[PDB]
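Hi R.,

Here are the chain sequences for the assembly we discussed:
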Amino acid sequence: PVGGLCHYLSPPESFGSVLEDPVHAVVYIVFMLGSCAFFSKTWIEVSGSSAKDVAKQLKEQQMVMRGHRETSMVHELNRYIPTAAAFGGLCIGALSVLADFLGAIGSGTGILLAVTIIYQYFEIFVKEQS
Amino acid sequence: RLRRQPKYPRKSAPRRNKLDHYAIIKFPLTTESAMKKIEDNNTLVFIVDVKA
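And here is the predicted structure of the full complex:
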């Protein structure tokens, strides 16, 4: 909705900075950051990448912590896995807000998808070259 | 009985202390029991020098 359309919810768009009522601009980033962490936190619960599932993968591969039992795998994973998804989703959402506000190429959003995937195949590229 | 008044020290310099603070704590123990002590007893588990 950029013209002749309902403007209740809309991403900010302007050269430099646009500010008439912050009750619209600051709310957009709040809903964007919260949703991203909400989406990231729920994805691991369904994609089989939570702390509980990772330990089952490591148990299957016969990998253990140095001085912990098998049951303590989950607890050490829970120290980082659940909070990394919540904070990682928040950070990647914040990068989109920074990308959108700065007005980069690609209108900010979408380049985060591009930079990650090109990095995703980078790990293949480096390991296939000794 | 006189107190000693040496004409020269038998050692040129005092021996440097080698059990300093960095030599006292080698590394922290990171095990399940150590983590229990950290999160429940408010206790840090370290491996230290024997003479300390």
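The first helix of chain B runs from residue 21 to 24. The radius of gyration of chain B is 21 Å.

Let me know if anything looks off.

Best,
T.
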